[PDB]
Amino acid sequence: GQPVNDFIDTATRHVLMRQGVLGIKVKIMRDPAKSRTGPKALPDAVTIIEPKEEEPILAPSVKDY
Amino acid sequence: XXXXXXXXXXXXXXXXXXXXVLSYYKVDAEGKVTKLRRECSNPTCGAGVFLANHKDRLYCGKCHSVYKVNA
RNA sequence: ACCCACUCGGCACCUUACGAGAAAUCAAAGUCUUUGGGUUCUGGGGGGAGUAUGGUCGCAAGGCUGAAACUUAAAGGAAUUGACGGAAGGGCACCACCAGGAGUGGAGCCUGCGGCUUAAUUUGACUCAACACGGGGAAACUCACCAGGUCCAGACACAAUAAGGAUUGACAGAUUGAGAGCUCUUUCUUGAUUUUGUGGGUGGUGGUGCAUGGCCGUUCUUAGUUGGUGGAGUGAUUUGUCUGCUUAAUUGCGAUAACGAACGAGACCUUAACCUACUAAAUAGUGGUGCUAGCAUUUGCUGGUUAUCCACUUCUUAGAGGGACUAUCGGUUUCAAGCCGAUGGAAGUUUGAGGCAAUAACAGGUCUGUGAUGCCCUUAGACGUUCUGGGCCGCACGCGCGCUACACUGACGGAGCCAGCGAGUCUAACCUUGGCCGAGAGGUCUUGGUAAUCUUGUGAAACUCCGUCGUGCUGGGGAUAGAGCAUUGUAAUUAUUGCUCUUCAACGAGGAAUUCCUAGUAAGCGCAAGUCAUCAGCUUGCGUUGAUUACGUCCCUGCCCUUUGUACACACC
Ligand SMILES: [Mg+2]
Ligand SMILES: [Mg+2]
Ligand SMILES: [Mg+2]
Ligand SMILES: [Mg+2]
Ligand SMILES: [Mg+2]
Ligand SMILES: [Mg+2]
Ligand SMILES: [Mg+2]
Ligand SMILES: [Mg+2]
Ligand SMILES: [Mg+2]
Ligand SMILES: [Mg+2]
Ligand SMILES: [Mg+2]
Ligand SMILES: [Mg+2]
Ligand SMILES: [Mg+2]
Ligand SMILES: [Mg+2]
Ligand SMILES: [Mg+2]
Ligand SMILES: [Mg+2]
Ligand SMILES: [Mg+2]
Ligand SMILES: [Mg+2]
Ligand SMILES: [Mg+2]
Ligand SMILES: [Mg+2]
Ligand SMILES: [Mg+2]
Ligand SMILES: [Mg+2]
Ligand SMILES: [Mg+2]
Ligand SMILES: [Mg+2]
Ligand SMILES: [Mg+2]
Ligand SMILES: [Mg+2]
Ligand SMILES: [Mg+2]
Ligand SMILES: [Mg+2]
Ligand SMILES: [Mg+2]
Ligand SMILES: [Mg+2]
Ligand SMILES: [Mg+2]
Ligand SMILES: [Mg+2]
Ligand SMILES: [Mg+2]
Ligand SMILES: [Mg+2]
Ligand SMILES: [Mg+2]
Ligand SMILES: [Mg+2]
Ligand SMILES: [Mg+2]
Ligand SMILES: [Mg+2]
Ligand SMILES: [Mg+2]
Ligand SMILES: [Mg+2]
Ligand SMILES: [Mg+2]
Ligand SMILES: [Mg+2]
Ligand SMILES: [Mg+2]
Ligand SMILES: [Mg+2]
Ligand SMILES: [Mg+2]
Ligand SMILES: [Mg+2]
Ligand SMILES: [Mg+2]
Ligand SMILES: [Mg+2]
Ligand SMILES: [Mg+2]
Ligand SMILES: [Mg+2]
Ligand SMILES: [Mg+2]
Ligand SMILES: [Mg+2]
Ligand SMILES: [Mg+2]
Ligand SMILES: [Mg+2]
Ligand SMILES: [Mg+2]
Ligand SMILES: [Mg+2]
Ligand SMILES: [Mg+2]
Ligand SMILES: [Zn+2]
Numbered sequence: 001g002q003p004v005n006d007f008i009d010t011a012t013r014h015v016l017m018r019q020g021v022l023g024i025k026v027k028i029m030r031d032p033a034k035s036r037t038g039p040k041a042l043p044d045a046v047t048i049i050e051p052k053e054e055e056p057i058l059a060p061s062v063k064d065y
Numbered sequence: 066x067x068x069x070x071x072x073x074x075x076x077x078x079x080x081x082x083x084x085x086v087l088s089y090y091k092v093d094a095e096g097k098v099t100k101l102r103r104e105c106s107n108p109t110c111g112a113g114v115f116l117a118n119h120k121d122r123l124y125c126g127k128c129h130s131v132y133k134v135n136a
Numbered sequence: 137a138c139c140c141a142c143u144c145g146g147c148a149c150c151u152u153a154c155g156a157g158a159a160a161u162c163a164a165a166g167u168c169u170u171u172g173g174g175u176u177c178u179g180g181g182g183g184g185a186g187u188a189u190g191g192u193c194g195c196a197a198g199g200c201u202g203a204a205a206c207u208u209a210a211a212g213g214a215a216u217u218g219a220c221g222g223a224a225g226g227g228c229a230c231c232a233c234c235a236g237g238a239g240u241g242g243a244g245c246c247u248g249c250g251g252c253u254u255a256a257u258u259u260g261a262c263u264c265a266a267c268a269c270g271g272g273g274a275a276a277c278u279c280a281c282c283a284g285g286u287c288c289a290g291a292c293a294c295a296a297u298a299a300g301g302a303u304u305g306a307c308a309g310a311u312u313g314a315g316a317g318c319u320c321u322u323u324c325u326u327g328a329u330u331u332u333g334u335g336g337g338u339g340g341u342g343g344u345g346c347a348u349g350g351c352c353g354u355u356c357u358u359a360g361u362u363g364g365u366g367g368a369g370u371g372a373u374u375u376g377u378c379u380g381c382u383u384a385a386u387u388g389c390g391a392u393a394a395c396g397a398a399c400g401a402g403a404c405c406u407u408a409a410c411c412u413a414c415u416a417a418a419u420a421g422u423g424g425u426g427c428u429a430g431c432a433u434u435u436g437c438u439g440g441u442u443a444u445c446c447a448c449u450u451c452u453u454a455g456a457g458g459g460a461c462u463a464u465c466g467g468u469u470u471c472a473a474g475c476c477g478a479u480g481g482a483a484g485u486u487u488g489a490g491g492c493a494a495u496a497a498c499a500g501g502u503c504u505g506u507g508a509u510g511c512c513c514u515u516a517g518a519c520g521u522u523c524u525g526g527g528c529c530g531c532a533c534g535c536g537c538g539c540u541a542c543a544c545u546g547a548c549g550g551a552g553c554c555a556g557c558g559a560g561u562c563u564a565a566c567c568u569u570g571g572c573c574g575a576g577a578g579g580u581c582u583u584g585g586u587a588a589u590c591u592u593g594u595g596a597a598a599c600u601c602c603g604u605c606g607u608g609c610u611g612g613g614g615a616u617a618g619a620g621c622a623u624u625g626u627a628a629u630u631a632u633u634g635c636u637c638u639u640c641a642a643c644g645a646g647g648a649a650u651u652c653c654u655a656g657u658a659a660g661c662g663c664a665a666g667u668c669a670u671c672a673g674c675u676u677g678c679g680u681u682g683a684u685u686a687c688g689u690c691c692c693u694g695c696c697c698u699u700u701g702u703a704c705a706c707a708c709c
């Protein structure tokens with residue numbers, strides 16, 4: 001998919017030797033968190049903000065200013 | 066593949082012949098020098114270059130061929 | 137006779153496993169390096185071989201006893217994971233079938249393949265996954281093939297020749313297809329650039345895709361791959377990754393010695409749909425106004441006018457947003473994931489269609505895309521290259537993709553008259569409107585455009601309407617062939633293509649077979665783009681007209697999955 005275009009660089013290189021040639025194929029996948037100028041995460045990613053304990057009750061009452 | 070055939074007769078090349086040449090020019094009894102063979106009135110060939118003597122034919126070789134002066 | 141409890145001794149099963157084992161497994165195969173209850177028998181790597189020999193028993197066939205030489209690095213056991221089967225159980229799919237549509241298979245031609253022919257008819261590829269494929273529509277070129285002619289563009293090093301010239305070129309004639317000084321005659325020219333030899337290079341559409349890279353196709357219209365902590369196992373391993381249900385999906389639910397995750401699917405991206413909300417526009421358009429034509433006249437109706445001005449953004453353009461999450465409701469389901477129906481909605485089949493796409497495999501195709509490349513071959517009487525000419529088109533015939541037809545839901549003739557995706561000329565001749573001339577093809581003079589500006593509203597074709605014909609190989613059909621005219625091109629003969637007249641074939645719905653397809657789809661219909669000097673019956677996209685039939689299954693076929701067997705693991709070639 002699309003994240004491929006966004007996050008992985010590839011290169012093929014032909015390395016000519018005494019016997020024949022070999023194909024080097026390099027693939028690098030870069031930290032998307034660091035994206036900088038694009039999307040900062042995979043389309044996959046789904047973060048939930050973590051609530052907060054509450055200490056409720058305290059029967060009514062009102063503040064004045 | 067197939068290899069070879071030939072109803073024969075291979076073609077050769079050329080030679081530039083021999084000739085200890087430019088004897089042509091003649092100097093009299095000490096020491097006046099007269100040119101044999103006439104030279105070229107083309108601006109390109111400042112009259113050092115001569116004309117070969119055939120028949121009808123006098124011809125400038127320096128002009129790689131160029132021009133047909135006839136006397 | 138039957139039931140309950142007990143107990144000796146039987147044939148067995150069940151669950152455990154403290155314990156054993158290399159494991160499979162085992163209440164003995166336990167009580168074994170913490171090694172001793174009694175006793176009997178047999179084995180000491182594989183083959184050679186239960187062979188030779190002697191003894192013995194037998195009527196015999198044979199039985200018992202039973203060697204060595206020599207050969208050899210493994211043979212063997214159990215389990216694991218793969219791979220594979222002409223074993224079994226499940227699934228998925230219009231490259232499967234059901235219900236059907238439109239066909240192909242029959243005909244004419246077009247075009248590839250075989251075959252034959254040939255100087256040559258260059259060549260790759262042969263089930264799906266070779267054959268309108270190599271973007272492969274070849275007149276030269278391309279081009280590799282064939283008949284023949286030039287050239288070196290043979291780096292460099294050493295040696296040799298050699299300034300008394302190493303070498304170079306050529307006018308005319310001869311030659312030659314040729315205005316190739318190819319060679320020859322002849323005799324000027326040139327000046328250390330070459331020549332000759334060896335060494336070494338260099339080019340090659342020469343060989344090897346079974347030496348390679350890269351790319352691509354296929355498996356795959358598939359759903360699979362892995363690691364952390366836990367559990368099992370001495371171990372390779374396994375569980376997680378599973379009976380079921382569910383999904384297009386190892387997509388999920390659920391079950392659960394597993395829990396929680398990552399690659400792949402999904403997400404993501406592109407394009408088609410919806411925004412009287414946002415920002416705008418003489419390279420897009422609308423309303424008002426002026427200038428103005430025509431028809432009515434009573435306002436009116438229908439046009440002209442890239443700026444005569446004013447305002448707008450519904451339509452067009454493209455930025456930014458918004459929108460859908462199978463929403464609401466209800467059926468159904470283990471009331472789970474889901475599935476179904478109704479309403480709403482631009483939109484509810486993964487929204488439609490694509491792009492991307494893991495792990496692994498193949499001796500799939502490509503050395504003929506590459507100045508990617510190993511090795512082999514070849515290298516001046518070239519397999520380098522170029523030039524002239526022919527050839528890839530050759531035709532008893534087999535095969536594939538196609539085009540056009542057999543007519544009356546039609547052909548012909550008037551007339552109506554509507555798309556979308558494209559593309560176009562600088563140091564050049566591309567897209568072409570308009571005016572004339574021409575039956576046509578085309579010609580000619582001008583013209584706008586490097587483009588939302590001009591071609592172009594690309595006035596496309598099927599289609600619609602009024603006529604002619606009237607079922608007759610007919611006015612359906614347009615093969616084959618003759619004559620003439622033009623266009624591209626240096627060149628049109630074997631006829632590039634276009635036009636006119638004439639000639640008027642087979643084909644009366646196509647055997648056995650076989651392809652493709654579920655909605656703006658199928659089928660019909662044209663167009664633009666690729667190729668392109670010229671040539672589309674091909675492709676790639678595009679819009680126009682627009683259905684019948686399923687919404688299911690495992691019968692055929694194909695494939696994945698379990699279970700199972702394996703003496704395979706280079707893995708059933
Ligand atoms: Mg995806
Ligand atoms: Mg002289
Ligand atoms: Mg056990
Ligand atoms: Mg035990
Ligand atoms: Mg017991
Ligand atoms: Mg032994
Ligand atoms: Mg023996
Ligand atoms: Mg005996
Ligand atoms: Mg005996
Ligand atoms: Mg007897
Ligand atoms: Mg014995
Ligand atoms: Mg014996
Ligand atoms: Mg031995
Ligand atoms: Mg096994
Ligand atoms: Mg059927
Ligand atoms: Mg049929
Ligand atoms: Mg060839
Ligand atoms: Mg296939
Ligand atoms: Mg040629
Ligand atoms: Mg030459
Ligand atoms: Mg040499
Ligand atoms: Mg050599
Ligand atoms: Mg080559
Ligand atoms: Mg291969
Ligand atoms: Mg390869
Ligand atoms: Mg081959
Ligand atoms: Mg399908
Ligand atoms: Mg499994
Ligand atoms: Mg695993
Ligand atoms: Mg799938
Ligand atoms: Mg009025
Ligand atoms: Mg009025
Ligand atoms: Mg708008
Ligand atoms: Mg509705
Ligand atoms: Mg979409
Ligand atoms: Mg290649
Ligand atoms: Mg080669
Ligand atoms: Mg190429
Ligand atoms: Mg390359
Ligand atoms: Mg060659
Ligand atoms: Mg051909
Ligand atoms: Mg064939
Ligand atoms: Mg095909
Ligand atoms: Mg008509
Ligand atoms: Mg005329
Ligand atoms: Mg102009
Ligand atoms: Mg338009
Ligand atoms: Mg008839
Ligand atoms: Mg007709
Ligand atoms: Mg011709
Ligand atoms: Mg021919
Ligand atoms: Mg007729
Ligand atoms: Mg029919
Ligand atoms: Mg052509
Ligand atoms: Mg075209
Ligand atoms: Mg083609
Ligand atoms: Mg067995
Ligand atoms: Zn001269």
